[PDB]
Structure formats: structure tokens, C-alpha cells
Amino acid sequence: SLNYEYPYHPSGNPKHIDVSEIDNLTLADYGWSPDAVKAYMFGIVVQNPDTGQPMGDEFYNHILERAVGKAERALDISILPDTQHEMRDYHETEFNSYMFVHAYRKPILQVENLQLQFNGRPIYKYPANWWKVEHLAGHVQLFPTAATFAPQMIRLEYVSGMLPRKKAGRNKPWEMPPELEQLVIKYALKEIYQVWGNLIIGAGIANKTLEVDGITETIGTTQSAMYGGASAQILQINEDIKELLDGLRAYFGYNMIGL
Amino acid sequence: SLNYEYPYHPSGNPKHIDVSEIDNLTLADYGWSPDAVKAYMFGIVVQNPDTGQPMGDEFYNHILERAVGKAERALDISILPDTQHEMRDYHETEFNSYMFVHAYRKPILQVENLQLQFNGRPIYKYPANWWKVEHLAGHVQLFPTAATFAPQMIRLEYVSGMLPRKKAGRNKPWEMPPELEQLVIKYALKEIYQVWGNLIIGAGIANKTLEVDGITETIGTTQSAMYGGASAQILQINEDIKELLDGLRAYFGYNMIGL
Amino acid sequence: SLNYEYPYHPSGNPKHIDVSEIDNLTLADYGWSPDAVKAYMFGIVVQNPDTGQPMGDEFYNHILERAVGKAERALDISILPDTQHEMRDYHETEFNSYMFVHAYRKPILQVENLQLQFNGRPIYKYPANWWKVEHLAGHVQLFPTAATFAPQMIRLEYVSGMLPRKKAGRNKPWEMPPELEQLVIKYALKEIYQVWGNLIIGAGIANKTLEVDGITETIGTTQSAMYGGASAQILQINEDIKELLDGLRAYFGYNMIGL
Amino acid sequence: SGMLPRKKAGRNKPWEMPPELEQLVIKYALKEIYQVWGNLIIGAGIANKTLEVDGITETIGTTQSAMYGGASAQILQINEDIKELLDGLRAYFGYNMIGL
Amino acid sequence: SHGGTTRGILQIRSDQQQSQHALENFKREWKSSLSGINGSWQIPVVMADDIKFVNMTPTANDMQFEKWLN
Amino acid sequence: SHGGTTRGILQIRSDQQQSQHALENFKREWKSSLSGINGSWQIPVVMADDIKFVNMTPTANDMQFEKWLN
Amino acid sequence: SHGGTTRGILQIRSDQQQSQHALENFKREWKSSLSGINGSWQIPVVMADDIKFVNMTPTANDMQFEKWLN
Amino acid sequence: EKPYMIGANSNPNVINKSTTYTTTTQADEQDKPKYTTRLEFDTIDMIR
Numbered sequence A, B, C: 001s002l003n004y005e006y007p008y009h010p011s012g013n014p015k016h017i018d019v020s021e022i023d024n025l026t027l028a029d030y031g032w033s034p035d036a037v038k039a040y041m042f043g044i045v046v047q048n049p050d051t052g053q054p055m056g057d058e059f060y061n062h063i064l065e066r067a068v069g070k071a072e073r074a075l076d077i078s079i080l081p082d083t084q085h086e087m088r089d090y091h092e093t094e095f096n097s098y099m100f101v102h103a104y105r106k107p108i109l110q111v112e113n114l115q116l117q118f119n120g121r122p123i124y125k126y127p128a129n130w131w132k133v134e135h136l137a138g139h140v141q142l143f144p145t146a147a148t149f150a151p152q153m154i155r156l157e158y159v160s161g162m163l164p165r166k167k168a169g170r171n172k173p174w175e176m177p178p179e180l181e182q183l184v185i186k187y188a189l190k191e192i193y194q195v196w197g198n199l200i201i202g203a204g205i206a207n208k209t210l211e212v213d214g215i216t217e218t219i220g221t222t223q224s225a226m227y228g229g230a231s232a233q234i235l236q237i238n239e240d241i242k243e244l245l246d247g248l249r250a251y252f253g254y255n256m257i258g259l
Numbered sequence D: 001s002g003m004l005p006r007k008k009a010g011r012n013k014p015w016e017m018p019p020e021l022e023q024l025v026i027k028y029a030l031k032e033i034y035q036v037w038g039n040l041i042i043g044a045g046i047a048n049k050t051l052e053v054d055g056i057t058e059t060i061g062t063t064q065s066a067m068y069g070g071a072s073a074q075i076l077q078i079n080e081d082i083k084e085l086l087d088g089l090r091a092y093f094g095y096n097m098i099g100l
Numbered sequence E, F, G: 001s002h003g004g005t006t007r008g009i010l011q012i013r014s015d016q017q018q019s020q021h022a023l024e025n026f027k028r029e030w031k032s033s034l035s036g037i038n039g040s041w042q043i044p045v046v047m048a049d050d051i052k053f054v055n056m057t058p059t060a061n062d063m064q065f066e067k068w069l070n
Numbered sequence H: 001e002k003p004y005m006i007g008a009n010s011n012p013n014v015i016n017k018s019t020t021y022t023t024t025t026q027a028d029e030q031d032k033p034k035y036t037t038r039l040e041f042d043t044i045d046m047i048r
């Protein structure tokens, strides 16, 4: 015997996240606070030169949200916990192959419903224990116990994304590796340096020298006609992101579909 | 049993947008305000050099409308919600394939009418529950229950666009991804920098120095005989768009037509 | 006769790590302390220019955790000790080959359980003495004594990681090689130099000179319009990592999967 | 497994450590040392400087540059020797083969 | 009775690996246009950068080791 | 009765060697789509940088040293 | 009765020669997946930089100097 | 939860801003530092 909520079986598709907590989890829980960005910029402070106003957390959160979006496209991933209502077609060869299904959004934390319907009326709903999942790849497969295609025959409901990492330096396949946190940070810093590079001295000023009444000063900025003042930081960020992103793609791998 | 407006079935083509709200929705709803442009230019003020005038909000709206327009082609999309009246030809091979139809503009939020006519008279109008849609790809397919080609046999009415995203860091396939917001912003900034770059110093002046009674003032700008004043930022924006745009075409994918 | 805990056999899968100690072991045990980072930066102090603050140890730990994480992907490894609950599919060709299994994460310090189940009920649990392991490669093979595939038939529990090295200049295959220590250190330093390089002089200032009442002070830094302040060291660290990383992949070798 | 220390000058048995592995490890060590020492010659990140006070003036130009670090010359020569040293030593052990 | 019956692999070069949703829609279009006797003789069109087809098995298969059996 | 019956090797170029978990999922997809009579005639799609198939044995095998035996 | 019966050599390019332990594990995987009738028709996958197979003997062997003997 | 959006500007308009004059006072203060590279002569080489 065994005890479990009916949709969730400890074998195959163990429960990981309560549905209600999905709304509670936010960017701050994953470490994407503006503080982290500031830490990486330790010793550099950005202000509006015309005033004493530094940019507030609103901009940082806004940038970070679009950064985590950009990383979510950079690998074909779902990067925050999110419920999906998916309708999928009937392809015979995969159907005969234990009803193999490749979810659009991966990883799969857990599967709630998996039904076969004809006109909105459920023709047949599978037992919970029958269906089994592969979290990282998102494969959903069925193991029954005791024309060549049609559209939108089956109805799939599941939760996609990654849980925050619980233990230091480690992550489960259903768990966020720390680099996606860092990668999104580095994508955020690209925008920040694209802002901060303009404000060091006036605007568009490469070289200056000023002499008054026996005191003289000369300054030569990193600004140039060919490259912007922060271009060195951006170009180093790219060098790290490329290594970071190429290595991480090996954790997920290439995508394949039959034809 | 089930309750729904007759054109809309919760299974297949659930309702997403009220027809009347199509007019109401505008650029401001999606965050494409002039303030957004200014925010990315934090610390930079675009101002006439010979008089204190700053460029108004209207110019930003005008630019933003062209930024969203350029994006709508650059990835073959219809982005703002709009109602479409579409006639399509009869091709036997697709017709036998559950009446497959590839809408000219995507995504499809919802489908209102799908009828077959001969000379303007509807020969056969299908039940609502029969037809089903693929929102992102825009595939329209029919699943009936209980010469080789002709022109403009069928008639299709549908709403093309994307709704503003409801929740952070997430979007439904029928929902505007965060990247399009940033992409359209970056397109707009490419125009604004092209304007502003002429207003750094004078007109086409690279190097200057005044020496008056032993006073000395000296400036050397980013402007040069072979590089423009803002061309440092424009180049960096190209490097940014290339990463963003390529990564987003992977979300929509390549187009295909049989022959 | 022989004495041992039932899951652990001295032949094949001898015990290496107590389960409880898994929690205790941390980064400090492997020498990844902030002091290590400082030692490699002997003579350099990372300090805010406008106030006397040095960056704290917490930042180093945060960086180090991301350095070890990046390494764990860059060579497909599980490096810190952790307990794994793994389900694997039945492939006939490997199964007839003494039940060959390639663990998703390696090295395997030890194996606790290896069972075959049908619907959550263990159909057959093998004797401990039967199964044998290859620690470094993680191969699990069974040596019994006196459709063509199915999903998630078998259940595997094992501990993935490496123990801290006991003796100098030597390591067992189940033991952390010294190179990973230096490699993770060098990854961390790549981040720290990226931070510190902005704090050399001012903000994006390449060349300077003050002339006051016949006094003269003049500095020209490593910072330049096309090279960053620490980019000299970062380049040298890349040249170092390339030699180190390539030489270490030869220790683990290439991956292979039949098809 | 391993190698015994060399007993007789300029010679080694197959079971005996050739002196170059000693030197090779030294040169790998020096790579780290020069990667440290190169930073500390004058301040940090300073390529060129000149200072004039009260009729006395001094100018110094370091090996530091935006493109290369102060010890880069030593490191790059160490690499040139290690490559020769390592390629030659691989011929003492040879390539690895396994049947299949 | 066992695998290895593939004819070849159709490679399509792209800067980014297409998302699985896009590949599924690609398959839907391919099946609707070309699958089966219906639309058998038709030709698809693709506008990618470069396409290759690499053969894993010969043009025509037949029994092996016939003379050995004899 | 002994090895050497391989037809060839399918090489896929990548900057990083894919993790074994990814290769296992790759195998799962391949087996589900192509293995056996089921889905025999189908064509897979892969979007890697470059793919090669190198032949280790000829197109068709047969008995060797026949005239020697005669 | 003497050597020279090799079919060819499978070269795999790498910056470093793989350690013998790695090659032994490589052999273990190869034997478990492909050796014998079991898994005969399967195809392995390798993600190295470049692979070659150089032939040392022809496609099919037979008796030599037949007409001389006659 | 809700998406993070820029929203509207908040800075009010100011007219006729007067300069700041450092106030004379006998009280003590603390001189706000900058920590950075220092230049010095090579006195040993001067001896040489």
C-alpha cells in the first residue's frame, strides 16, 4: 500500500511544488535582487550627473526580468514555475511507443492531468500510477498495468520551471543550477554597463585638457570614435557568457523531432 | 454539457480577447511609453543645442510605432491585436489532411467564423466544436464528429495579435513575450541615437581648442571623419539585437509551404 | 566469511563515505576558502576607491559556489558529495550485457540500492554481492552467482561526488584531483579581476596628468578604449585554463551512447 | 605506481624519475609565481608615469601594457620551453592504444 | 526485429536550436502536406541557411552472407 | 560470434561533449520515434553544427576466402 | 597463422591522448552496447572533433597467386 | 508577481537654483578620502 495525493505518485512523478506556492515564488527567492547586481559592480556607483539621483530598484528589477526572459530564449527552457494547459496531436508511431510525449516547456516539475478527449468529453482518463515522467527532458510516457494522425486528441496539464536550489553547490535535475542565476545577472550587467558607460564624463567626450591661471589638467577617457567607454566590460561579459552558455547547453542537449 | 458563446469553444479555441477591447488596447498597455525610452537613456537629455527645447513625446510615439512596425516584419508576425477577414484557396492535399490551413498572420488569439462558399452563398458552415486551432503556429484544423485546386473557396475570420503579459517572467504562447518589448525598444533607440548623435558638439566638429589670454579649453569628441558621434552605441545595439533577434526566431521557427 | 554492512560489499562497491557526513562536508574542507583567493592575489587588496571598505568574505563564497558550479558542467561531473534517487529505462541490449548502467552523474562513491519494479512494487531486489561498480566512469554492472524497451523499469540510489584528498600529490579515482581545486580557483579569479579592474583609477580613465604651480603628476594605466584594466590578467588566465581544462578532460574521457 | 628519485647523476632507470619532470614541474610552478610577481613591480595597473617636483624629475615606463601584463614576456618564454620539453618527453612514454 | 532501419538524417543549420514547439509545428505541416499517398509527389520548400542529408544505410538493402548460408 | 559487426559511427560536432543524461534522452527520443518496424520509414531532424557518418564496414558483407576453401 | 588480418584503424583526434583508464571505460561501453549479435545493428555516437577510419586491407580478401599455383 | 514596469516620472520642476557656498565654521571636520595609486621617486636609484 501507499499514501499520496491522487495525481501525484511517489514513483515516476513525485510531488515537488504545491500549486498555491507557484504565485508566491518570485525573482527575489532565486537571488535576482538588485543587491546582487550592485555587488558585482562593487565600488562603481551610477548617478544622473545633473542631479543626485541614482537609479532605483525599479529599473534593476525591470532589467532583470527582461534578462531572465532573454536567457529563457537562449536555451529552449521554462525558467520560472508556471502551469501549462497543453493540447497535443496524435502521432501513431510515438503513440505506439508507450505514448511518448515531448512537452513544449521543460523541465517538468510534476504532472496533474493526462486525458484523451474527442470533442471536449473525456473519452478515457488514465490511472495516475500508469503515467511516468522524465523531469529534465520533459518526456511523458505511459506504462499500462493491471489516417495516421489526428489533431489535439490528448489533453496535458503540468507545471514547468525550476525550483530554487536548496543545498549549497548542488542541484537536482528539477532544481536551478546556480549559473542560470549568474547568466541572467551577466545579461543584466550588459544593459547596466550599456547605460553607465555614457555618464562618466559629459557625453561624447574622449579627450580634454583645461589650463587656468597656472593650474592645468588633462584627462583621456576610454571613450573613442570606434568604441564606447564601457566596451571593454561588455566585451569581457560576452567572453564569459559564451563559455557559460556553451557549457550549459551540454546540460540540456540538442533537440530532435521525428519526421 | 458546457456553457460558452457559440463561436468560442473552451476546448480547441477558448476565448481570450473581447472584440470591443481590440480598439482600447494600445502601445501604452504593452509598456511602449516614451518614458521607457528615456529610462534606457538615463542621464542623457536630447535637447536642441541652440535653444533649450527638448524633443517631445509625440516624436517618441511616432518612432515607437515604426519600431513595432519594423519588428512585425523582421519576424513575420502580427503583434497588436487586430481582426482579419481572410479568403483562402482550396488545395486538395491539405484539405484531405483535416482541412489544414496556415493563417497569413500569427499568432491566432481566436477564431470567429470558418465557412465554405461558392459564389458568396455559404454552402456549408461548420459547427463550432468541430474546428480546432494551434495558436502560436496559427494552424487551423477541422475534426468532424457525429481540377485539383480552386480559388478562394473558403472564408476565415480571426483575431491576430498578442495580449499584454499578465504575470512576471512568464508568458502563454498567445501572450506577448518580454523580448519583443525590449526588441522594439532597442529598434527605437537606434533611431533616437541617430538623431542625438548630431547634437553632441556643433555640426560635424571632431576636435577643438580655444586659447584666450592664456586661458585654454580643449575638447576631442567621438565624432570622426569615418565614424559618427553615436556610432559607438549604435554598433553595441547591433551586437545586442543580433543576439536577441536570432534567439527569438527559434521560438517561432522556420516557415514551410508544400509544392 | 566476511563482515560488512549489507548494502556495502568490500569487493566491487566498498564503502567510502558515511551518509550523515554528506551534509557536514562543505567547500572549506576542499580548501575553497576566500583566503585561497586572496593568496593567489598576494599583494593586491580589493577595496572601494571612494571609501575604505574591502569586499567581504560572503562575496567570495558566493563567487566560489558559482565557480564550482561552472566547473561541474564544464566537465560533466557531480563534484560535491550528494545522494541521488535515479530511475532508468530498460534497454535490452545493455540489459543482456550484465545489466550495464551508465549513471547520469559521476563519479559513484558507492551504491546503496539497485532494484527492479513494475508499478512501485519491487519485483526483484538483487543481492548486494552480485552488483559491482566502476567508480570513475560510474558503470554499474551485475554479475549473478549461485517490445524491445520499457520506461523506468529499474530504480537506482547512489552517492555522487569526490572526497577531499587524504595525501599530497596523489588521489584515488574516487578522490578529488588537485587540478579541480586550482581550476575552480581560477574560475573564481576571473570574476574577481572583472570586479577589481574597474577600481584601478577613477571610472574608465586611461590617461591623466595634473600640473599645479610647476608640480606635475602623470599616470597612464592599462585601461584603454579597446582593452579593460584587468584584461591582461584575464587573458593570461584563459591561457592557463585552456591548458588545464583540456588536460583534465583526458582523465575523464569522451562520452558515448549506443543507438 | 610512481617513480623513485634518481640515484646517479645525469642518468635514470625506466623505473626512475628523469630530471626534466622535476624541471617541468618547476616551470609550471614558475608560471604561477610570475603570474603573481608581475602585478607588484609598481602599484597596480600603472604602465607609464612621470613626476616633476622642484627641479627634480623622473620618468619610468613599465613592461605593463593594456595588451600584455608585466611578466607576460617571462610566461611566454616559459611556454616556449615547456612545449619543447613536453613534446620531447611524450616520446619517452609514447601514444596510448586500446583494442576494440 | 531491432533498430537500425533508418535511411538517413536531415540536418538543418541554424544559429539557435529551434524550440520543440516550433519543431512540432514543423512536423504538423510536413505531415499535413506530404505524408502518405496524399501529397506524395509534392516538393516542400525551406529557406534555411544550409541543409544536408547524410545517408546511414545504402540505397537498397538485401540479404547478407548469402553464400555463407549456401 | 565475436565483435566487429558495426556498420559505422555517427559523429556530431559540438563545442562541449553533451552530458550523459542528455545523450540518454536523445536515445529515448530516437528509440521512441524510429526503432523497429514502427516509424521505420521516418526521417529525424537535428540542428547541430556538422554531422558525419563514417563507414567501418563495406556496404554489403559476404563470405571471405571462398576460393581458398574450394 | 600469423598477423596482418586487421581491417583498419579508427583514429580519433584530441588535444591530449586520453588516459588508459578512460580508454578502458570506452571499451567497456563499446563492448556492452555493440559486441556480438546483441546490439549488432546499433549505431554509436561520439562527439569528438574529427574521426577517421583508414583501411589497411581491401574490402574483401581472397586467395593470392591462384594462376601461379595452377 | 506583477511585471516590473518603468511607469511615470516623478521629478518636479525647479526654477532659479542658487549656488552652494561652503559655510565658514571653526568646528572640526573629516576630509573625505580617495584610495588609489601613489607616485614616488626611486630614491635608491637616485643614490646610484
Ligand SMILES: [Zn+2]
Pocket: A102, A137, A254, A255, A256, F025, F029
Ligand atoms: Zn528533447
Ligand SMILES: [Zn+2]
Pocket: B102, B137, B254, B255, B256, E025, E029
Ligand atoms: Zn508555420
Ligand SMILES: [Zn+2]
Pocket: C102, C137, C254, C255, C256, G025, G029
Ligand atoms: Zn562514460
Ligand SMILES: [Zn+2]
Pocket: D095, D096, D097
Ligand atoms: Zn600503453
